Amino acid sequence: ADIVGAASPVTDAELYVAVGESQVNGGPHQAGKAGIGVGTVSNAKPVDFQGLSLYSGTTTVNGTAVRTLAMPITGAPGSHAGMGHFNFVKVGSGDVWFGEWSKDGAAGGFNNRQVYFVGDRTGTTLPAGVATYSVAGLNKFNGSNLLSGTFRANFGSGTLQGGLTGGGLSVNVNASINSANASFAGSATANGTVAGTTQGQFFGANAATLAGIATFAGNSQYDTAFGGSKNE
Ligand code: HEB
């Protein structure tokens, strides 16, 4: 596998997540896939998102299946008591994910919140010309505040620009596409005033999908995870 991803900054030495290639072969978990670890379970050894699917709830909004995971879960070991609260979305048919995590979810105020994306880059190529993407975004998801918008990619010029809006929040991104590794990086702007950065990745043949995070250091409430599939 060729797993790539990123998470916004950790806020605590134990209450945090990190993304990367999954390492756990045990229970429902399989190594070698797009994964996440939490500091409260085996010092964040990562497990695969795919395996979490059959145990996660679903809230579908505007055609986006937001997956939700938190204790209690039948068959989860006691070591998992402090796993926290995950909201995450599978992007397309491949092993591509974006989402957020917090200690206590909506009921507790999304403490220790982080955003992330992670996916398998195997087989990724970039097409010629231009394409647009229907993108969804998550920031403290409560069931009715999903962000949505359109990103515009110009692969000939190496630009990715777009915006997401929802639940009173607007995030715009302006990034440069790196054709050597199909990543992108640039600025992010929240509600037209708050400066941050964007980092993300195209996945799949002919850039079938993308995922990324927009983060705002010193203004972290606006941190947003996003992803979507190419239009057509
Ligand atoms: C059922 C259901 C379930 C679920 C949902 C889960 C979810 C999870 N998980 Fe799991 N796990 C499990 C079940 C589970 N799990 C099991 C069964 C196991 C095995 C262990 C034993 O054996 O006990 C594990 C195991 C495990 C491990 C290993 C540890 C050691 O060192 O060994 C880890 C790290 C984890 C994590 C995790 C996470 C992070 C999550 C989320 C996100 N996990």
Q: Which atom of ligand 1 approaches the CA of 38 most closely?
A: 39
Of the candidates 91, 92, 112, the residue with the CA atom closest to the CA atom of residue 223? 112
What resolution in angstroms does the PDB record give? 1.8
How far is CA 115 from each of CA 16, 31, 211, 222, rounded to the nearest angstrom?
Answer: 10, 22, 12, 10
Could you tell me the two tokens for 3?
């797993």
**What does the alpha-carbon distance between residue 72 and residue 20 come to, in Å, rounded to a whole number?**
25
CATH topology of domain 130-230: Porin (2.40.160)
Query: Contact, 130 vs 155, CB < 8 A?
Result: yes
**What does the alpha-carbon distance between residue 203 and residue 206 come to, in Å, rounded to a whole number?**
8
**Is 157 exposed, middle or buried (CB count within 10 Å of its CB: 0-12, 13-18, 19+)?**
exposed
Of the candidates 126, 87, 122, the residue with the CA atom closest to the CA atom of residue 225? 87
Strands of 47-48's sheet in order across: 17-21, 34-38, 47-48
Q: What sign for the dihedral angle of Cα 46, 99, 101, 163?
A: positive
**140 CA to middle of ligand 1, Å?**
25
CB of 61 shorter than 6 A to ligand 1: no
Q: Please, which residues have CB within 8 angstroms of residue 82's CB and are 6 or more apart in sequence?
A: 15, 38, 40, 41
Query: Contact, 188 vs 197, CB < 8 A?
Result: yes
Of the candidates 84, 75, 79, the residue with the CA atom closest to the CA atom of residue 10? 84
Q: How was this structure determined?
A: X-ray
**134 CA to middle of ligand 1, Å?**
33
Q: Which residues of 158-168 are buried (b: 16+ CB within 10 A; e: fewer)?
A: ebbebbbebee
- Give nearest CA residue, ligand 1 atom 4: 76
Domain spans in the chain, listed from the N-terminal domain onward: 3-120, 130-230
Annotated binding site for heme: 42, 80
Gyration radius of the chain's alpha carbons: 17
Backbone angles phi, psi at 79, to 5 degrees: -60, -15
State the amino acid at position 140 in one-letter form: K
Q: What is the 3-state secondary structure (H, E, C) of the chain?
A: CCEEEEECCCCCCCCCEEEEECCCCECCECCCCEEEEECCCHHHCCEEHHHHHHHCEEEEECCEEEEEECCCCCCCCHHHCCCCEEEEEECCCCCEEEEEEECCHHHHCCCCCEEEEEEECCCCCCCCCEEEEEEEEECCCCCCCCEEEEEEEECCCCEEEEEEEECCEEEEEEEEEECCCCEEEEEEEECCCEEEEEEEEEECHHHCEEEEEEECCCCHHHCEEEEEEECC
- Going by their DSSP bridges, the two strands 209-215 and 194-203 should be labelled as antiparallel
**What does the alpha-carbon distance between residue 184 and residue 182 come to, in Å, rounded to a whole number?**
7
Q: Which atom of ligand 1 approaches the CA of 75 most closely?
A: 1
CB of 42 shorter than 6 A to ligand 1: yes
Residue given tokens 């918008």 in the structure block: 149
63 sits in the region (left: phi over 0; alpha: psi -120 to 50; else beta) called left
How far is CA 78 from each of CA 23, 98, 219, rounded to the nearest angstrom?
Answer: 20, 26, 35
